[PDB]
Structures are given as structure tokens and as C-alpha cells.
Structure 1
Amino acid sequence: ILQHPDGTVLKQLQPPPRGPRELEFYNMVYAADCFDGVLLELRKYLPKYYGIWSPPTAPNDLYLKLEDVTHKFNKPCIMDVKIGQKSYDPFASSEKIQQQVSKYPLMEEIGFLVLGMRVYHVHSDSYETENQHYGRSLTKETIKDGVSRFFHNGYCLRKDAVAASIQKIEKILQWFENQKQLNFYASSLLFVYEGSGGEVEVRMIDFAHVFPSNTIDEGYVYGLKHLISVLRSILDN
């Protein structure tokens, strides 16, 4: 992710097949002839898409030009959460499945994984960052506190941001419960709140493993439900 002053990010396409698949996903969704009600509603929950972009002198070098979801914040607190029971897709090899499950073998049980967070702390005027090893170290016993950390400014628990996050996740959940045409593997929710009142972004990102489907995305729904449940419990802290 390259953060651009104009309020966009440039995401470099991942190597094939993943990068191409994410391009086709955005292209399908934001198809200017699309009157598919499911895909039109989905746009709300994605970064705005500005199409494929390459450097003027380098058409080989493919990026997606996306809305920077953090742009309108002063001191954004950002958390990336991978959603689902499986982070491998329907066409993964045995080795690939093993690779994916071994990265975090608790994915089936919990249904989400914190990829990272950046949390602004008021009283130190500084950011605490957690990397992928943080979320991958969380278990059933520590997931509530693991998530809570995102919402601590170093004086209070931001229950406003927690409650707002539940409400925005709920709308994404409602979308998923009204579509049986896409299944999403190894995709994430990007959470943003203001670290400097109930002012939150919750957006879907990372679409290298989105596939056509005939069914409810049961794994994704499970993940959203469990995440909402964790966030709900945090409101009782």
C-alpha cells in the first residue's frame, strides 16, 4: 500500500494469479453497466475504485487506485482483520492448504485474525504498532483482550468506537446474508477510528481470493458474528 496525498492509495497487484483476480473483482463490482443490486450495494463497503493505474513510463507496473479509507482522519487508529474460517480458497493444493492453516491454525475456531493495528496514544503523542505475529499469537482465551487493545488510547476504552464498529459490521453482515454469488477467502476488514466520537470506518479490503458461489459465505458470516460477539463483550468492560 502506497499512501498518496490526494486521498488515494495505490495497491500494487500481487503476483499471478492473485493480483489479476483482485483486478477482475474490482472491475466486476464497479462495472459501469452493472445494475446487479447485490454488487451495487457492495460498493458502499469497499474502497472507492478509480480503476487500474500504471506509471506513465511503466505500463508493466500494475496498481489498483483505491480510496484511502484513513484519509479523512486526523490521527487514524487502524486495524486490519482477516475474516473467515478458511484463508485458503477452493482451488488450493494440499500443500497450500497446509501452508495457510499453519499460518494460523485457529482460523476455523475463531473465524478471524488480527493482521495488525496502529493505535494513537494521546498522552505520549505516539503510535503503538502490532504486526502479524501479534494476532497470530491470540487464542480463544486472549482474543477479547487482543482486540480490546485497538480501542485503548491510554486513558479510556473507546466504547464509542467499539459500538460504532459493531453497527457498521452489522450492515456488512446483512449484505452477506442477502447474497449467494460471492465467497471471500483471505479478505479483511479495515477498521479506522479517530485517535486525536463514534466516528468510524469499517471497510472490506483485499480481494485476491474472491470466487463465484452458489451458497452463503458461511465462513465469512461466522467470522463477522464472532467478531461482533467479541466487540459486544468489550462493551461490558
Structure 2
Amino acid sequence: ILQHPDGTVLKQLQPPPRGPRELEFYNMVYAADCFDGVLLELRKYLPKYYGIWSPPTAPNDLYLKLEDVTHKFNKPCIMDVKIGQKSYDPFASSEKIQQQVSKYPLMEEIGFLVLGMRVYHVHSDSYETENQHYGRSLTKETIKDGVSRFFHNGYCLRKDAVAASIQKIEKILQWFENQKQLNFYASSLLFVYEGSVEVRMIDFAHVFPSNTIDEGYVYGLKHLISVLRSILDN
């Protein structure tokens, strides 16, 4: 992800087939002549899409031009959470499945994985960053405290941001409970709050047509909501 001053991010397409699939996803959703009520509603929860972009002198180098969801914040606190019970898609080989489950074998049980966070700390005027090994080290015993860490800001637990996060996730869940045409694998929620709320769906390299509820994604959202709810009792 490259941040542009104009309030956008440029995401370089991942190698095939992932990058092309993510392009086609954005193209389908933001199709100008689209009057599909499900897809129109979905736009609210995605970054705004500004189309494919490539450098003037390099047509080979493909990017997506997306809304920077963090742009309107002064000191954004950011957390990326991968959602679902399976991080592999319906066309993965046995080895790919093994690779994906190996990456975090608790995905089925918990239904989400923290990819990382950046937390602004007022007292030090500095950022605490956690990488992918942080979330992958979390178990059922430590997931609540693992998530809570994100909301430690301003000499307190930011229960305001926790409650707001629940409310925004709930709307996304409502969308998922009113559609059976898309299933989402290895996609994320980006959480942002002001450290000095946004919750948006990102990363669509493994979104596929379906004729069923995305039960794994729903499970993930519900468990995430349950964890966040518990944090409100801290």
C-alpha cells in the first residue's frame, strides 16, 4: 500500500490470479450500470474505488486507486483483522490448503486473525506496532486481551471505540445476512479510530460467486462482536 497526499492509496495488483481477481471484484461492484441492490449496499463498507491506475510511462505496472480510509484521522489507530474460518479458497490445492491452515491453525475455531495494529500512545507521543506474528500467537485464552491492546489509548481503555466498532461491524454482518452471491476468503476488516471510527472491508483477491450464506465470514464477525462486547465489561 502506497499512501498518496490526495487522500488515496495505491494498491499494486498481487501476482496472478490474485491481483486480477481483486481488480475484477472492484470492477463488478462499482460497475456504473450496476443496479444490483446487494452490490450497491456493499459499496458503503468498501473503500471508494477510483479505477485501475498505472504510471504514465509504465502501463505494465497495475494498481488499484482506493480511498485511504485513515485519511480523515489526525493520529489514526489502525488494526487489520482477517475474517473467516478458512483462509484458502474453494479452488486451492491440498498443499495450498495445508499452507494456509498452517499459517494459523486456529482460524476454524476463532474465525478471525489479527494481521497487525498501529496504536498511537498519547503519553509517549509514539506508535506501538504489532506484526503478523502477534495475531498468529493468539489463542482462545489470549484473544480477548490480544484484541484489547488495540484500544489502549488516552490513559484508558477506549470503550467508546470498542462500542462504535461493534455497531459498525453489526451493519456489515447485516449485509452478509442479506446476500448469498459472494463468499469472501482471506479478506480483512480495517479498524481505524482517533488516537489524538471506521470499519471497512478490504483485500478481495479471494472473493468468489456463491449461492449460499458466507457462513465462515458470519461466524468470524459474530465471534469478533462477542469478544469486543466482553471488552466493554473490563
TMscore range, shorter length = over 0.9
Deviation of 1:155 after TM superposition, in Å, equals 1.4
| TM-score, L = length of structure 1 | 0.98
Do the aligned partners of 2:8 and 2:65 also contact (CA within 8 Å) in 1?
yes
Do the aligned partners of 2:154 and 2:195 also contact (CA within 8 Å) in 1?
no
SS at structure 1 position matched to 2:169: helix
Do the aligned partners of 2:54 and 2:60 also contact (CA within 8 Å) in 1?
yes
SS at structure 1 position matched to 2:109: helix
SS at structure 2 position matched to 1:129: strand
In the TM superposition, what whole-angstrom CA distance separates every residue of 1:143-162 from its partner, at most 9, and x where no partner exists?
00000000001610000000
Question: Equivalents in 1 of 2:96, 2:186: separation in Å?
Answer: 13
Structure 2, unaligned runs of 5 or more: none
| TM-score, L = length of structure 2 | 1.00
In the TM superposition, what whole-angstrom CA distance separates every residue of 1:180-224 from its partner, at most 9, and x where no partner exists?
00000000000000000xxx0000000000000000000000000
Question: Equivalents in 1 of 2:144, 2:3: separation in Å?
Answer: 30
User: RMSD of the alignment, in Å?
Assistant: 0.4
Deviation of 1:6 after TM superposition, in Å, equals 0.3
In the TM superposition, what whole-angstrom CA distance separates every residue of 1:101-157 from its partner, at most 9, and x where no partner exists?
000000000000000000000000000000000000000000000000000016100
In the TM superposition, what whole-angstrom CA distance separates every residue of 1:61-94 from its partner, at most 9, and x where no partner exists?
0000000000000000000000000000000000
Question: Equivalents in 2 of 1:100, 1:142: separation in Å?
Answer: 22
Question: Equivalents in 1 of 2:96, 2:36: separation in Å?
Answer: 33
In the TM superposition, what whole-angstrom CA distance separates every residue of 1:8-37 from its partner, at most 9, and x where no partner exists?
000000000000000000000000000000
Question: Equivalents in 1 of 2:154, 2:122: separation in Å?
Answer: 7
Question: Equivalents in 2 of 1:16, 1:95: separation in Å?
Answer: 18
Q: Identical aligned pairs, as a percentage?
A: 100
Paired residue for 2:215, among 203, 212, 218? 218
Number of aligned positions between the proteins = 234
Do the aligned partners of 2:183 and 2:209 also contact (CA within 8 Å) in 1?
yes
Question: Equivalents in 2 of 1:24, 1:87: separation in Å?
Answer: 20
- Corresponding position of 1:184: 184
Question: Equivalents in 2 of 1:42, 1:125: separation in Å?
Answer: 36
Q: Which runs of 4+ in 1 moved over 6 A?
A: none
Structure 2 residue 204 is the aligned partner of structure 1 residue 207: yes
Structure 1, unaligned runs of 5 or more: none
